[PDB]
């Protein structure tokens, strides 16, 4: 078995992982705790980052680079921007931008800079399993585009223009971050999330309703998934 | 010797320290090239993150978990804010802030994730080495606050927001990044940044004039510092 890295951004989105496995290890390492664990012949790491691009890139590089991570496993919760995404649905990323990297005052699009590309992929096989399992566990799961950036959208105008840029589905503060390092290292990842909001006018509201529920069916179906790894 | 990390944004701060070591070796890693050479029995490893607060993360993690770097120094260009600072000018920084990390539907302040400060603090050891190189070699150095963030900032109205919330003295994309990453990891950090531009109207067209030679004169700096560690 492989060694798998499975990451959140909050505490509320990796706590059911921990209660579940029950048995586990701690390191202290980059000001948080890493947790080590066995699960179906895979050795696991698994954290929470801390809010954020910054934050979240940090511990998908530490997981990868210190503790030798080969396949990286994101779970967490999102803004709905796509309508027919409810409160609770499932949606992995095929792609993921950052809405909010911009240097666009010297002509290029917004979510470039040179180097890299506005879009960064997820990994096919990965995906493709997600499938196999949401199917096998009569799960809803949907395919889509995420933008990652470093605000809370709670807000139509802002919601609106993302969605029309990027045509994504959904906004977060971490899965572009973590895609690019994964990709940057040669490390397939998967970026699942569960709608806690839909991202407009009290999207702070049903963030903190919904938030530890949509966390919960995000991290099972994560799991799911390293048993079949 | 230590293992010092010297890292810069883009290949205009980082080529000149190259141009003057001579001999290096090149290494493809994190989808991006790692340099190395021994400078007055120091080992180096420098880079070029490519812009942005995700690439800069991810840089200085890999110099730190990958390479073993056990300190620090940032150089590169910034914008100008403080009205006392001109083109070419060197500031380092005390601390900086994320002005666009932004969670404030919660009610908190702009700059502000759990379990992480507004700002982040530079070692005073390295600062302290720095004032000593700036008097020894007659280089005027300024002391300052920098506000990092994903935009590069054109625009008077954003300056003075920013300058005001923070009380910034220049901005740019990559410091409280990489600083945030050296504190989490337990490394000293050095952020020298010369103005090639003041973040208003045309700064673009500062920038392009001026990006080669304040480049430079950060470059030559950190060099300067390498001599004394
Ligand atoms: C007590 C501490 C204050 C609560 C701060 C919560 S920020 C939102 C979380 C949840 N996560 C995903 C997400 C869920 N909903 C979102 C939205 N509307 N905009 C941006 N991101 C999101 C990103 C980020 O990790
Ligand atoms: C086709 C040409 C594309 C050029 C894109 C350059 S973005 C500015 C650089 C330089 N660096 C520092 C900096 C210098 N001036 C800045 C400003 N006004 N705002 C934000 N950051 C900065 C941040 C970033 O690494």
Redesign the pocket.
């Given at each position: 078995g492989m060694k798998i890295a499975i990451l959140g951004a909050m505490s509320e989105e990796i706590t059911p992982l921990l209660e579940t496995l029950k048995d586990y290890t701690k390191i202290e390492h980059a000001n948080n705790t890493y947790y080590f664990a066995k699960y179906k012949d895979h050795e696991l790491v698994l954290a929470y980052s801390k809010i954020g691009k910054v934050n979240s890139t940090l511990s998908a590089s530490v997981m990868i680079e210190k503790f030798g991570a080969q396949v990286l496993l994101f779970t967490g919760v999102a803004g709905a921007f796509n309508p027919e995404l409810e409160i609770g649905d499932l949606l992995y990323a095929t792609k993921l931008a950052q809405y909010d990297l911009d240097?666009t005052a010297?002509?290029?699009p917004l979510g470039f800079?040179?180097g890299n590309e506005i879009f960064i992929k997820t990994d096919e096989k990965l995906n493709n399993l997600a499938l196999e399992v949401a199917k096998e566990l009569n799960i809803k799961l949907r395919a889509g585009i995420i933008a990652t950036g470093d605000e809370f959208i709670c807000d139509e105008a802002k919601k609106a223009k993302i969605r029309e840029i990027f045509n994504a589905d959904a906004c977060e503060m971490e899965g572009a971050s973590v895609a690019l390092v994964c990709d940057a290292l040669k490390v397939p990842c998967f970026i699942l999330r569960a709608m806690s909001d839909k991202a407009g006018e009290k999207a702070e509201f049903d963030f903190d309703e919904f938030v530890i529920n949509s966390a919960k069916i995000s991290a099972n179906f994560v799991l799911k998934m390293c048993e079949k790894l």
């Open positions: 240097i010297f002509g290029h800079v040179p």
